[PDB]
Amino acid sequence: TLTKHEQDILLKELGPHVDTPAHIVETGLGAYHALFTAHPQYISHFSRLEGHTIENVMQSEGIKHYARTLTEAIVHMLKEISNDAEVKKIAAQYGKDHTSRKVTKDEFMSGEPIFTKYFQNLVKDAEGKAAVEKFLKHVFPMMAAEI
């Protein structure tokens, strides 16, 4: 399980990106710009991104909705990342948000390297970039097991 120290480093270094509603949305938008630039065929899987392609998805109203839900799901797991039983419970809930959707388990896991690089570019030092990678490597398989 991640240590309380690692939880503290993550919360401290990601704090300026998740401290206001506007910051939450800008952090999420960056994650989707990375995910869809690598895999633009994933836009079609999200119901509110109907009618859009890579040329115009980032300007949509629907992408702002998912920017908040993705980022706030991540911050909920970060807040409990040193509590093994709670983060496993939370991650199971977020994985279950994907079971009946159009996304495959392989597509879901393809987000790991993209979100790791993106979130690592938001933090300031190597310790925090390593914690971001450890965090995502721990929660991605918990969520993916529900898919």
CA distances from 37 to 41, 46, 54, 85, 111 (A): 9, 15, 7, 35, 12
In whole angstroms, how close is the CB of 144 to ligand HEM at the nearest point?
9
Spatial separation of the C-alpha atoms in residues 79 and 83, rounded to whole Å: 9
CA distances from 109 to 32, 61, 126 (A): 15, 26, 24
Q: With respect to ligand HEM, which residue has the nearer C-beta, 5 or 102?
A: 102
Binding residues for heme: 98
In whole angstroms, how close is the CB of 70 to ligand HEM at the nearest point?
5
In whole angstroms, how close is the CB of 24 to ligand HEM at the nearest point?
13
Query: Which string of DSSP letters, residue by residue, matches 90-147?
Result: HHHHHHHTTTTSS--HHHHHHHHHHHHHHHHHHSSSHHHHHHHHHHHHHHHHHHHTT-
In whole angstroms, how close is the CB of 101 to ligand HEM at the nearest point?
4
Which positions lie near ligand HEM, rule CB under 6 A?
Answer: 42, 45-48, 69-70, 73-74, 94, 97-98, 101-103, 107-108, 111, 115
Q: With respect to ligand HEM, which residue has the nearer C-beta, 23 or 45?
A: 45
Binding residues: 98
Spatial separation of the C-alpha atoms in residues 63 and 38, rounded to whole Å: 16
Q: With respect to ligand HEM, which residue has the nearer C-beta, 97 or 133?
A: 97
Q: With respect to ligand HEM, which residue has the nearer C-beta, 130 or 142?
A: 142
